[model samples]
Target: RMIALDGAQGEGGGQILRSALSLSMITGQPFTITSIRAGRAKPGLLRQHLTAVKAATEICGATVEGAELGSQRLLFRPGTVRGGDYRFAIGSAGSCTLVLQTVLPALWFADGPSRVEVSGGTDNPSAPPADFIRRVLEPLLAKIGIHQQTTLLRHGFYPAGGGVVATEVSPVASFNTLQLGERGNIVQMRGEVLLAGVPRHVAEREIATLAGSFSLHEQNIHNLPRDQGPGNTVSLEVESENITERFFVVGEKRVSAEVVAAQLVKEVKRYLASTAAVGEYLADQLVLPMALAGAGEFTVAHPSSNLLTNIAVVERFLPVRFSLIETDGVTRVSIE
Candidate 1:
């Protein structure tokens, strides 16, 4: 039996497509999605999205139709995913992390050890940076018995992208339940200001603004602007007993550095003031793994429409339903 999915549902973006493609391969379920990104700017599959389809096909040997740039519909029937060493290059400034998201879940249920190395943009404005996977998400994946480690081999941001990330995983023998309703004590908070070609004072100003709010244990200034050329971002990492959360904001060309830094500081402040264990982005990341295990829970500040769309896709594949209970200004997301 084939599942029919509407690509325009909910958040109506590439996420619905990404989650469906990943889940279809893992469950060995065939699916067809129509109206792909119907209500969005530059609707339909683009090059970077097509590359993910290519990687998905290569990994599972999946038979796919509508695998072209600008296509609005797709039919995918996946074969058994074989765990082994693999490499893929996404050319220019595409988000390789999204491509990895498309394939990594199926790797969890593979027969043996697996290694995947991808090349593309590591730090992009549109997606989570490699540091997020390395510092925030990987530890949670390990705690739930999915043995995996991802390493950032090079610094590749936008435009002149040449970053590389390598990930290795051991097939899962069991699944463990994760309870992150409370993040517990604030163990550490570190801030990083990446300056590629921008002035050093830009980093100093961003850090100085951040210092007013967070007692940063480690203040790092990566002088990337020196060699990497025009780049600036404020990355704040919160290390708690249960979770390490990373918040990022890219600098715009016309926006003032202080305002750019203020944007990130405000984001950190919202997360810090909440009684939530998982921040918004982390909540989206946890949904799939928790649903796969059929039991897990976490407290989040707010559920984005994107996350609701994610859960919608998960329900389509897995025989699981997620419960989002809001209490005392925090939403508890769970599946059991």
Candidate 2:
């Protein structure tokens, strides 16, 4: 069956296209997305998106139409998902992690194991960093029975694009239901500053600001250099009994170090305030996996448009239905 999705619906972002592509490949369901990324500042497909299209085509021999740069429509018909050594390059700082994410699920069911190497931005501010996928999301995916490992070979920031991420997936027979409710007790809280060709004071000030809010010792903070960028990022990691959550704020040339640290601190506090096992970002990332598993549940903060959009896309390709309920202070999402 062909699924028709309006790309401008709900959150109206690149995820609308990415989720649809993932579902299409997984179910062997062809989809036609019109007005792709129609609601963004510069609407329509960009290099990042086009790269995704190309990668999906390469992995599965999918037939793709309207994949040119700036095109707002795409037609994707997936073929057999092949498992083997594959490599994709975005040719820009566009997120290599996102492209990897789009096709990783489908590859899980491939005939054999697959190793994918993606070159481009590994730590873009707009998308989940490679570390976040490895540290935060992948653990929960492990609970659901998808085993994969990811490595960041280089750091790629915007504009001066030159980063690399590699992942290997073991073929899966099926997925298991994931149940994450209580966040449990805090095990550890730490922060990291990734800097390249940036001033040390920026990182120091950012760490200092975080120290004022949390009981962070010197060991809880660290810095790294890839000689890879003129880029900086402040990351806060919260390790709980049930799950690990990480929040990141990118440093802009205009934004002050204190401002970036404060923003990340605020995000960290908000997640700590919730008993929900999953944060808002993880909630969105889990929907497709749960739908594929056919049954799973998790507690999260109020659903965001991104999460809702993914649910809508998943329901279209799979027979499963989602039920969302708000109780006490958190939202519970379940698939049936």
Candidate 3:
């Protein structure tokens, strides 16, 4: 069956293509998408997203119609999915995590075990860092029949972007239901402030800002500004009830260090107050895999425009429902 999709939904990030392509490879469904990433500054296939497309196409031995950087449309016909060792490089500081995000689901359903190595940005300001991938996402996903192991060979920030990560996946034909209804008390907490080619004060400012908000101890915080990459931001995290939520911020020229720090701290507090399992970005991401597995559902802060966009794309491939009902000021989405 052909999966028809629209890339111009929700947050309007590249995830629409990432999710659709991943699902398409696994289901062996040919997909057609238009208005790709309609909301970004240059809405279309960016390098990071393009890299994912290429990897998926190679994995399934599929022929792709429009898989170029900055392309606004695509048609992907997946072939047989062969499992083995594969290596891919984003060639930029693009978030390798996002690249994995695109294809990991499908790979998890592949017939045999698979190993993947991706090189690019690992600690970019826009998405989950390597820490989240290794600790929160991978660990909990194992319980649901999606098992994987990841290693961050090195850290890559933004601009400079040469970070590398390796991952291994073991497939399960089906997934178990997930119910993260209540967020238990915090079990562990850690924050890392990464700076690249920037002043040390920037990292310090980020830690200082978050310290007041979370009461983190000196041992709980670490500063990393000497890594390779352009200027970047900080991370504030809190793990509870088996869920670790993370908040990130990127630094820009003319933006004050204090302002950058405050932004990340604000996000941490916001996610904490909502009692969300995954933060905003990740909430949008979990919908597709959960739906495919046919089990488990939880509430999160509302799906951002970016999230809504991803949902629209996934519907083109299969059946899904992403509806939000408000409970206690938190926008909880139940996906079934």
Candidate 4:
């Protein structure tokens, strides 16, 4: 059976296409999508999206159409997934992690283990930073029976796009359900300022702002090589007994360091004010894996439109239902 998707849905961005690609590849279901990324500034396939299409095609030997850059439509028919060493370059500051996510689930059912290395922007807005995926997301995935190791080989800032992320994914023997309750006593909280081709005061001010606003245990500055950057990200890591969550604000070229870190403060404050176990981005990321396991639940403070859109796509592919119940501002997402 073929799946049909209208890419201009809830989030109205590349997420619909990305999620659909992963589902089609795994279910051996061909799908055609229209109006791809209809809401983005470019309004069509960007470098990363095109790279994702090619990467998905390569991993599953899928026959495809509308694979060109700026194409607004796509048709993908999948073959059996084959695991092997794979390398892909987005060729721009496009996100390579997004590409990895597209194929990772399909590889779980592959005949052998897979190693994938992709080069592009590792830290970009609208995407989770690589370390967050490794630190915050991977551990939860491991708890739920998805075994994968992800590493940041180098820093890849936006526009320059030279960073690389390497990951090794093993075929899954079984999937375990993950249930997250109240975020227990705070174990620790640290703030990190990642800077490259930027000045020292920027990091100092960002770190200082975090310290001023919250009781962060340790503040660290990650200084990357001058060659890889012109980038800045002020992030906070909250480690709780139940789960760890990471939040960050990507610094714009014209934005001041104070403003960037101020935004970070806002995110952390909002999450801290709630009893939710996961933040917005992690909420979106976990839904797919939980659905795959056919059981799991987590409490999130905010449910992003991206999370809703992901639930829409996942329900289309699998025989799973999701129930979201909110009480005292925390929403519990359950796979039923």
The numbered model that scores best in lDDT is 4
Best TM-score goes to which candidate?
Answer: 4
Model 4 off-target regions past 4 Å?
none
- Candidates' C-alpha lDDT: 0.85, 0.86, 0.76, 0.89
Worst 10 residues of 1 by lDDT: 223-232
Q: Per-residue CA lDDT of candidate 1, range 131-225, in tens?
A: 89878888898888888888877767677777788888898889999898777889999999887767778889888888888878989998753
State residue 5's C-alpha deviation in candidate 1, in Å. 0.9
By descending TM-score, how would the candidates be arranged?
4, 2, 1, 3
**What's each prediction's TM-score?**
0.96, 0.96, 0.90, 0.97
Clashing pairs in 1: 195-225, 196-224, 196-225, 197-225
Clashing pairs in 3: 9-309, 10-305, 10-306, 10-309, 11-305, 11-306, 93-161, 178-296, 195-225
User: Which residue pairs in candidate 2 collide?
Assistant: none
lDDT of 2 by residue, 1-336 (tens): 788889888877889888888888888999998988877788888878888888888888999899898889999999988899998889999998889888898888888899999899877887999999999888888878888888888888878778999998998777897788888998877878888878877888888888788766332433455566788899988888878888899998888888999999998899888898888888899998888777899999778899999999888888999999898989999986
RMSD of candidates 1 onward, in order? 1.5, 1.5, 2.5, 1.1
